[PDB]
């Protein structure tokens, strides 16, 4: 840690403080997460061990890089690449002017590429919110904060994810998570980039559900087989009609509304996958397929 100069505190979690630090020699700027081992009765925190090993496995342009792990004295330092700001700060800074649609398109495309890679690794992120998405000044965006990530070689169970980005199957009591919960979060973020306002800013589990219902319409067995049989489903739920996406996300064209609607499909079994979303015509301008063998 001799060659690092702390520049400013940029964060703080249960397991440590995060600092923006500058390599005094090379001039590199990194994000230092300092874990005070003296205060950890269970040693290296399980979330830190899990996140370190995962990031060493997941190398991708749209996944924050873990540059180093340094054990000095009684401190463990996680050295991460530094990105000047998160997506929440960028959206707030752009609230008056709005984010140009080609930049919204590029960011969503990149987010889905990083997510598709995680899903290919059989890893669920489970905490995709604007604060966990980092941008640089070169047009890139990366998934970050893998503390809640879990491998799904076997089902990942729900245990008694920020409310605003929580999928309705979770709110209704599903016993397991799926890759669809990550797609749901990105769908919420896609709408938030377009409207400059969180799509479903609930203040309780039931308020969050009703907010979803008021926009996408109250689910039924036709649009989501099994809803009425879910643990927290109540036949007393009010009957709201789905709203036209032209009113929900006005700046979006037909292709954008189509993708968003598939990312927010109620049925987890039918919600678009990350790889399928990348193939959606909304991204034809930004990508073109490769010849297929067989």
């Amino acid at each position: 840690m001799e060659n690092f100069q702390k520049v400013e505190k940029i964060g703080e979690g249960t397991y440590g403080v995060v600092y923006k630090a500058r390599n005094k020699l090379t001039g590199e700027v990194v994000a230092l997460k300092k874990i005070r081992l003296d205060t950890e009765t269970e040693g290296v925190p399980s979330t830190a061990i899990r996140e370190i090993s995962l990031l060493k496995e997941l190398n991708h342009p749209n996944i924050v890089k873990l540059l180093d792990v340094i054990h000095t004295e009684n401190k463990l330092y996680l050295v991460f690449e530094f990105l000047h700001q998160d997506l929440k700060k960028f959206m707030d800074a752009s609230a008056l002017t709005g984010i140009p649609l080609p930049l919204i398109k590029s960011y969503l495309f990149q987010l889905l590429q990083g997510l598709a890679f995680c899903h290919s690794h059989r890893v669920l992120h489970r905490d995709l919110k604007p604060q966990n998405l980092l941008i640089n000044t070169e047009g890139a965006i990366k998934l970050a904060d893998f503390g809640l990530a879990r491998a799904f070689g076997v089902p990942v169970r729900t245990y008694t994810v920020t409310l605003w980005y929580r999928a309705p199957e979770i709110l209704l009591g599903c016993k397991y998570y799926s890759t669809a919960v990550d797609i749901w979060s990105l769908g919420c973020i896609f709408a938030e980039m377009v409207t400059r306002r969180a799509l479903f800013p609930g203040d309780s589990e039931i308020d969050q559900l009703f907010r979803i219902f008021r926009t996408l319409g109250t689910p039924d067995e036709v649009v989501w087989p099994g809803v009425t049989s879910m643990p927290d489903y109540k036949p007393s739920f009010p009957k709201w009609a789905r709203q036209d996406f032209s009113k929900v996300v006005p700046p979006l064209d037909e292709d954008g509304r189509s993708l968003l609607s598939q990312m927010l499909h109620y049925d987890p079994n039918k919600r678009i996958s990350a790889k399928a979303a990348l193939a959606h015509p909304f991204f034809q301008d930004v990508t073109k397929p490769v010849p297929h063998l067989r």
Binding site: L37, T41, E42, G43, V44, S46, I49, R50, I52, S53, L54, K56, E57, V69, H71, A116, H119, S120, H121, R122, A151, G153, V154, R157, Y159, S178, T179, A180, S273, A274, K275
Partner: protein
């Protein structure tokens, strides 16, 4: 590596099966095995490792830890020892229990607490030593703690087959793998090969190939090496699936169990 290996994964809605498969195949390139690593520790004997791993399995049963947790600890232990030299018998319990502590923190939702890992050592390992050792191991392993274990390969294979009662079949194959892993010579075979060969002994070459992609030629040597182990298991009748308080029935086959494997190990090696 196994150029004759096909891809058995079915079509996947959530990802590109070719990419999922390639990622699984790449694990063997990062996570190495050295069946002769004990030659780096002249004062150790292979039976000491069988004794240590058998004791870890029993610890896992007592705390109802997952089979994945036990196999993570086995892989951490084996890879760590390959990076070290001249370890003596009196330090194996600490290395083993610390490997299990790391594995439980990775894999379990609510892992036992550190003082619990010190407790089962019956006053031979303190909590502070376990804390020191977990860091030694993790750094020597370069924080590469996500191998595809022997038992996770069994779940992959059984899931391809799915997509008598599968749960009982699973624990019976797992029990053969539990016996084989006690013999350091098992490390001659890729974890995926070991799992495919155990499944073959409870099924057929056709099913083995369909769920693992390996051709018969790929597993023949492992199968022949595994023969005495499968025979001693077969002569006893395989164990039965058990219920575990606090564990959902649909997850019961993933709980690590423990039987008198050291005696079986002797009869097999004979």
């Amino acid at each position: 590596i196994a150029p004759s290996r096909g891809s058995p994964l079915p079509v996947l809605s959530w990802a590109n099966r070719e990419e999922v498969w390639k990622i699984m195949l790449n694990k063997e390139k990062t996570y190495l095995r050295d069946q002769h690593f004990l030659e780096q520790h002249p004062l150790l004997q292979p039976k000491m490792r069988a004794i240590l791993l058998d004791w870890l399995m029993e610890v896992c049963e007592v705390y109802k830890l997952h089979r994945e947790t036990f196999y993570l600890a086995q892989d951490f232990f084996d890879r760590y020892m390959a990076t070290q030299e001249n370890v003596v018998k009196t330090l194996l319990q600490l290395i083993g229990i610390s490997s299990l502590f790391i594995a439980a923190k990775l894999e379990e939702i609510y892992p036992p607490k550190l003082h619990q890992f010190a407790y089962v050592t019956d006053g031979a390992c303190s909590g502070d030593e376990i804390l020191t050792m977990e860091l030694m191991i993790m750094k020597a392993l370069k924080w590469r703690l996500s191998p595809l274990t022997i038992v996770s390969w069994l779940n992959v294979y059984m899931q391809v087959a799915y997509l008598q009662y599968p749960q009982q079949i699973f624990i019976q194959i797992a029990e053969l793998l539990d016996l084989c892993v006690l013999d350091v010579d098992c490390l001659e075979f890729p974890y995926g090969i070991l799992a495919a060969s155990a499944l073959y002994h409870f099924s057929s070459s056709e099913l083995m190939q369909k769920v693992s992609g390996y051709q018969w030629c790929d597993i023949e040597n492992c199968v022949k090496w595994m023969v005495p182990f499968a025979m001693v298991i077969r002569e006893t009748g395989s164990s039965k699936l058990k219920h575990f308080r606090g564990v959902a029935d649909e997850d019961a086959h993933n709980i690590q169990t423990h039987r008198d494997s050291l005696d079986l190990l002797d009869k097999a090696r004979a």
